[PDB]
Amino acid sequence: MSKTSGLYTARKLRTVRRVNRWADKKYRKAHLGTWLKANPLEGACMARGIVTQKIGPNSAVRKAVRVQLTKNSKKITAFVPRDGSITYIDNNDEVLVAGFGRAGRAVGDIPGCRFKVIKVAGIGLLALFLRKREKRAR
C-alpha cells in the first residue's frame, strides 16, 4: 500500500529507516555530537570547579554561584539548593557540581540555571546541612 512490501526490498526499508530516524529530537541530541561538544560537562557525571562570585508568579530569589570548570575554562552558574548553604560557600572555594533531574534543560522556576552544588572543600552538602560533619578546616 503506502509502504514497500515486496520480497526483495530490504535495502529500501533499511535506507528509509536510517534517513527518517534522525527526525527525533532525543535521537538527534544523543547521537548527533553537537550537544556533547556544547555541554560544558562533556558527558561527565559531575565536575570539579572553582567558584568566583555569589549571586541569587513566585517572587522568591534563588541563591546560586558563578563557577569556572578547571578542565574546560568556560563559565556557568550552579544553584545551591539547601537552606542556609549560602554561608557555607565562600568565594574562591573548590566545589563539585552536578546536574538537575532534567539533563540539559532548566528545572523549576529558576531562569538560566542547570546545575547543583553537592560538595565544598570535599564535604557533602547534605552531610553538613544536617550537622553530621563540619567545615572547620576552611
Binding site: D83, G84, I86, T87
Partner: protein, 48 residues
C-alpha cells in the same frame, strides 16, 4: 533579613520498639486484633 531567623522540648524517653521480625508481629496485632480508623485529631485526644 537574617536567613535562618525562622530556622524547646525534651525528648520523651520511651522504650524502643521490638525490632527484628517482632515488628511485623507488632503490626499484626496492631490493627486486626486491636481496634482500628487512623489519623483523626479526636483519636489522639483519646490517646492523651
Amino acid at each position: 533579613t537574617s536567613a535562618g531567623k525562622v530556622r524547646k522540648k525534651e525528648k520523651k524517653e520511651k522504650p524502643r520498639p521490638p525490632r527484628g521480625r517482632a515488628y511485623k508481629r507488632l503490626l499484626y496485632n496492631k490493627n486486626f486484633v486491636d481496634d482500628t480508623r487512623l489519623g483523626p485529631n479526636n483519636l489522639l485526644i483519646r490517646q492523651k
